[PDB]
Design a binder for this molecule. Structure first.
Ligand SMILES: [Mg+2]
Ligand SMILES: [Mg+2]
Ligand SMILES: [Zn+2]
Lengths: 143, 70, 52, 137, 100, 63, 199, 67, 145
RNA sequence: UAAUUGCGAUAACGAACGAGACCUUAACCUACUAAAUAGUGGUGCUAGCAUUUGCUGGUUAUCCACUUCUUAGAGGGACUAUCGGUUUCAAGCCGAUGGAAGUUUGAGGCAAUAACAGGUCUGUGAUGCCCUUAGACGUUCUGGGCCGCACGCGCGCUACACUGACGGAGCCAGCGAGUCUAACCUUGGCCGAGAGGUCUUGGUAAUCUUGUGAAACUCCGUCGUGCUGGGGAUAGAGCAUUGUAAUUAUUGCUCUUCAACGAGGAAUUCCUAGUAAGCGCAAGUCAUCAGCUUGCGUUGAUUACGUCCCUGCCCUUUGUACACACC
């Protein structure tokens, strides 16, 4: 009934798109899972090793959908938080550039996100299709 | 490891008949009422809300708010 | 001739106040290159004024 | 047809057009402002004047420039000002006056932008008034 | 005809607006079409310094300010008249840059 | 515990060394024909209501 | 009862606000009455609010602080310990959870419960350093009651399992019932104890 | 405080001493003729003078005041 | 979550690589008692061995305990990068270990002893008990005891 | 009254400097002017969803109209407006209403007669006098020191935890700066776990960095109150960056030990509203280096709307054998 990606905002959409990424079977994982903290400003790896990469990919795809082309630097800034630098005041640190770049390359190999004519990557046609299908499924599951 | 760490096995009786004598139930209430250590409280409180006698009041997180079902 | 120059391309010894030649209190904003005292002296002369 | 709303620095531009009850905040429905506690703060100008009361208007806001709470207040007042201006221009003037009175009897800066601006900070201490700690001995 | 953009920049608001109006009037008496004079935001080159020339006294700071006000007017005209427009602007204090 | 309540009709002025107290003339709500001057710590305006456990004690100025 | 629907799909539980008697998102707001007759005009229930986040100017004048909704006054008084300065969203979430706990335990209109608790723990007499027993105005009574309640909840939730919301709930319940087992009532009677010894 | 200084009070006094068959007790029309009968060098000072003149005219109809 | 009665397979405080490990906390943080393994090393070990991180050492296993021990003593072979280890290029061999024993202290005192024997500034400072990483000793760490 | 601000009293009257006025800035203005260096409406470019045309999407040389948002020139607006009460006679004050703003509208800049043996000869190619001036106290180069540690003090940062820590997700500012004689802010792609490295690109700037996708914050999970998953001091190993030169670790990064600290005595600082406090960002110092400062913005309380109890200051009175004025 005219459903877009902007009908479930924050959490249910990601928790359903990651479940679709489980159903798809294609892992697309570079193997850095169990080794990376996802940011130099972090102090622990993601609490669940199976699932964090899928959630990162889901949120990244949704983020590129909601706006125009987005680059790995912008993803680093988005996903980097504050760092406990010890007895020094906290400071923002950019997120893991390799992780963000490999997530983007995985979405490229899936064809959901493609290169942009001015830089970075814009969501693709089948990407829009899949994102909107997940949004519709999430709505019909819980409105 | 002060009390009721992981086992709570000798004392199965009032883990079902516990909603009588106090209406309120929470992840911390389970700790308070001398029965189970909170290391498993937030995972035991999901069982009775999935099926049982405690009805949730909201979608609270970092806390639990449950009532006895009439 | 080959000993009278330690290299001074960077650091506080590389630049001096264009007026008084002091290496301390230097203001390098907007390319002023003026000591913080000489700039206070010749501030109205450059166009910098006090309003608030 | 085009109103604004500001609380401290956030500005929300509201476009009220002839339509069918579409209340969009950033392309999403009003149910997705997501502070999870000020959703009723964005619901205020609807339940104040009329539950639906509106099958003829469409409100589309776009907010930028502040923080989470500042934007929430900015949209909650921008949509109210858009409704008031729409009733002023097209619908009716006694209706506009009654709805503005209903807004003001609950006014939480729904109609008038908050006048409080950040005070400039003065040297000798962090903040506009607080000073660095002073020691004598 | 040649489409150009004249940029006027200075710290004196009255003297800058004098030429920003003279150019407009000199293009009106010649009956050209122009995209009206756009007023780009004034840049406050505020600079904070210590009042004391030494290290004694209450820590008193003072900020100076340089307000650079910039404007841009784009129009079209042939060479003979555009050169006259770029030669009328001799106001002391305002710098004028023409770009084709 | 005896019950008693009154309402300040006229606030006289600030009192106390540092000025934390205020002298107020209070009128007993029951038996309105009696005025007693009392001392109050918090802020007070007219047509305001106080509960005073002690009933009849003319509070003097606090040096 | 008039189940009107809108083009934007939203639950009718939010449309149920003005269809009947106006009330909170969860809690009736009209059936609130102070059990005493003195603290009236300083607790400001009715006007009712949809959430305790009425960010209004309440410090420009002297007595405008009194007309702030008492729920928001207690939400503000939760904003202490320095670390929790600001975080009004955290404070209002704590207030919501506390109202929910007061609803679970002898509901009694939890906002009316906190009103009764504040009225029962507002110290009616204090002492000034001259130490002379002076009276306490309603505004000071309300502010001190709120401060005592939030301080007791703060130091009860400090370093213990039960969260701030439930420590607040138990404190407010004991103050409403007027029992001497909680911090607000204990400190109120401590302040009132030196009234015959300071006259 | 909102106490008015000499440059306001004396100017308002003179304005009354020379323009009584003139501006009424409304500030909006009191500030308008100030521009034509007085060369004030700031609109804030003009508003201050006009406001004090309005106050003095409003309190002159209930008993003559000194000076 | 499930039935964990396990009347006879429950484990109280246990012995693992010369130190006592508490079975009342999850395995990852229970392992951190071993001098040589921290938060992230234990997190990597307990899920490289694919053991459940949501359960304690008291019910974890009896064989996967020794498997965790082995995966700790030989991380390099079993798919673990060099940079994740606490002692790489140790002093004389270039190959990377990760000291997990009552031996990290022994290797620290070995480094201090070789520094003092070769008369380096850091070893001299360690001998004196002063700060060695260029700190200011004027005002901080005065008592240090 | 904030004010020698004014009323008023009265051998004073009329005035001057200061205060105020003034200037800058932060507030509003559906009013004027003009904006592919700002934005919004719709036309073709029309990928998604739904399919009676509706939502969001996208088109930096793609059309028309405009300035509600933004910018900045000219102006407008507040003058405590109106209405009550209190004034002794008023200056004023206190409330309510209206208002964008009613506490000098908020905050600053400027700031009289003057006094200090206050600080600065280590800013000055400002300088009297004295000292030195070729084994120099000039200038330069190498290296070290300014940081050195039984100890005392001050400004601060991080904490003592659940109103929390950690992990995922939500992705919200403002003030600013940035290279053509050359190396600055860096978008994007690539490599790397990280810091970081490489190829380009945009920007001499409302254009690009940048929408500074800041943090605190919000949501959902793990933790379960423990010298614990709070806390990150101390040290070891390894990897890069800046720098001719990182040893006395410049800094950053990964791992590893996890010290005191369970809310702090006597005392003591700052602060009355977008203020305290929490939170981060930009700029300055910069080849590199923040726990510093100058500003900026986010979240936003409690209490008070007074007093001379303490402290400091001002005025008046008074004593003086002081006038080089209590040194
Ligand atoms: Mg030094
Ligand atoms: Mg410094
Ligand atoms: Zn200089």
């Amino acid at each position: 009934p005219g459903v877009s990606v902007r009908d479930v905002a924050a959490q249910d959409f990601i928790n359903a798109y990651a479940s679709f990424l489980q159903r798809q079977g294609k892992l697309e994982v570079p193997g850095y899972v169990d080794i990376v903290k996802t940011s130099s400003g972090n102090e622990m790896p993601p609490q669940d090793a199976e699932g964090w990469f899928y959630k990162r990919a889901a949120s990244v795809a949704r983020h590129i959908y909601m706006r125009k082309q987005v680059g790995v630097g912008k993803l680093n800034k988005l996903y980097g938080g504050a760092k406990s630098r010890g007895v020094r005041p906290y400071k923002h640190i950019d997120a893991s550039g390799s992780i963000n770049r490999k997530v983007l390359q995985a979405l490229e190999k899936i064809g959901i996100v493609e290169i942009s004519p001015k830089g970075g990557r814009r969501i693709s046609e089948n990407g829009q299709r899949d994102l909107d299908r997940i949004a519709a499924q999430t709505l019909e599951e819980d409105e | 490891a002060q009390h009721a760490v992981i086992l709570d096995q000798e004392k199965y009786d009032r883990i079902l008949k516990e909603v009588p004598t106090y209406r309120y139930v929470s992840v911390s209430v389970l700790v308070d009422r001398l029965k189970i250590g909170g290391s498993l409280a937030r995972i035991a409180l999901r069982h009775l809300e999935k099926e049982g006698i405690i009805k949730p009041i909201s979608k609270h997180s970092k806390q639990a708010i449950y009532t006895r079902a009439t | 001739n080959v000993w009278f120059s330690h290299p001074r391309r960077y650091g506080k010894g590389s630049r001096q106040c264009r007026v008084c030649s002091s290496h301390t209190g230097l203001i390098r904003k907007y390319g002023l290159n003026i000591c913080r005292q000489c700039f206070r002296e010749k501030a109205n002369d450059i166009g910098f004024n006090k309003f608030r | 047809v085009q109103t604004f709303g500001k609380k401290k620095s956030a500005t929300a531009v509201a476009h009220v057009k002839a339509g069918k009850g579409l209340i969009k905040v950033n392309g999403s429905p009003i149910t997705l402002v997501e502070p999870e506690i000020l959703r009723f703060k964005v619901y205020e100008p609807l339940l104040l004047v009329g539950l639906d009361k509106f099958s003829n208007i469409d409100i589309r806001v776009r907010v930028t420039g502040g923080g989470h709470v500042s934007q929430v207040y900015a949209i909650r007042q921008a949509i109210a000002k858009g409704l008031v201006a729409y009733h002023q221009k097209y619908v009716d003037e006694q209706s506009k006056n009654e709805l503005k009175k209903a807004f003001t009897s609950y006014d939480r800066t729904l109609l008038i932008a908050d006048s409080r601006r950040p005070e400039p900070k003065k040297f000798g201490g962090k903040g506009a008034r607080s000073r660095f700690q002073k020691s004598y001995r | 005809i040649i489409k150009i953009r004249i940029t006027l920049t200075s710290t004196k608001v009255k003297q800058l607006e004098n030429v920003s109006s003279n150019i407009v009037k000199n293009a009106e008496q010649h009956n050209l079409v122009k995209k009206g004079p756009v007023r780009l935001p004034t840049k406050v080159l505020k600079i904070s310094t210590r009042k004391t020339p030494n290290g004694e006294g209450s820590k008193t700071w003072e900020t100076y300010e340089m307000r650079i006000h910039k404007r841009y007017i784009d129009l079209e005209a042939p060479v003979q008249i555009v050169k006259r427009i770029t030669q009328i602007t001799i106001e002391p204090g305002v710098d004028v840059e023409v770009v084709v | 515990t005896p019950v008693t309540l009154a309402k300040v009709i006229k606030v006289l002025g600030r009192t106390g060394s540092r000025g934390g107290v205020t002298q107020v003339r209070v009128e007993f709500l029951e038996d309105t024909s009696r005025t007693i001057v009392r001392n109050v710590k918090g802020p007070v305006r007219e047509n305001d209501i106080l509960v005073l456990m002690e009933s009849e004690r003319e509070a003097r100025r606090l040096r | 009862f008039t189940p009107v629907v809108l083009a934007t799909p939203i639950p009718e539980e939010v449309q149920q606000a003005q269809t009947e008697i106006k009330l909170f998102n969860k809690w009736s707001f009209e059936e609130v009455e102070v059990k005493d007759a003195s603290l009236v005009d300083y607790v400001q229930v009715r006007q009712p609010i949809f959430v305790a986040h009425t960010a209004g100017r309440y410090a420009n004048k002297r007595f405008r602080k009194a007309q702030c909704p008492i729920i928001e006054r207690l939400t503000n008084s939760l904003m202490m310990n320095g670390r929790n300065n600001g975080k009004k969203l955290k404070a209002v979430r704590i207030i919501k959870h506390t109202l929910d706990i007061i609803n679970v335990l002898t509901d009694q209109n939890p906002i009316q419960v906190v009103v009764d608790a504040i009225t029962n723990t507002g110290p009616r007499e204090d002492t000034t350093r001259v130490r002379q027993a002076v009276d306490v105005s309603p505004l000071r009574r309300v502010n001190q009651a709120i401060a005592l309640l939030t301080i007791g909840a703060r130091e009860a939730a400090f370093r213990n399992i039960k969260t701030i919301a439930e420590t607040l709930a138990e404190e407010l319940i004991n103050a409403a019932k007027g029992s001497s087992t909680s911090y607000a009532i204990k400190k109120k009677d401590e302040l009132e104890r030196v009234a015959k010894s300071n006259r | 405080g909102r106490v008015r200084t000499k440059t306001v009070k004396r100017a308002s006094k003179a304005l009354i001493e020379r323009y009584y068959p003139k501006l009424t007790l409304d500030f909006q029309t009191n500030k308008r003729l100030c521009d034509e009968i007085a060369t004030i060098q700031s609109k804030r000072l003009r508003n201050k003078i006009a406001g004090y003149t309005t106050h003095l005219m409003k309190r002159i109809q209930k008993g003559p005041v000194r000076g | 979550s499930l039935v964990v009665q396990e009347q006879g397979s429950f484990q109280h405080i246990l012995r693992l690589l010369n130190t006592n490990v508490d079975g009342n906390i999850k395995i990852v943080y229970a392992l951190t008692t071993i001098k040589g393994v921290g938060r992230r090393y234990s997190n990597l070990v307990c899920k490289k061995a694919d053991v459940d991180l949501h359960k304690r050492a008291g019910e974890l296993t009896q064989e996967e305990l020794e498997r965790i021990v082995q995966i700790m003593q030989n991380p390099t072979h079993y798919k673990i990068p060099a940079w994740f280890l606490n002692r790489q290029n140790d002093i004389t061999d270039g190959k990377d270990y990760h000291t997990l024993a009552n031996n990290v202290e022994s290797k620290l005192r070995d480094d201090l002893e070789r520094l003092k024997k070769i008369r380096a500034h850091r070893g001299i400072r360690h001998f004196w008990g002063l700060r060695v990483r260029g700190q200011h000793t004027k005002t901080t760490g005065r008592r240090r005891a």
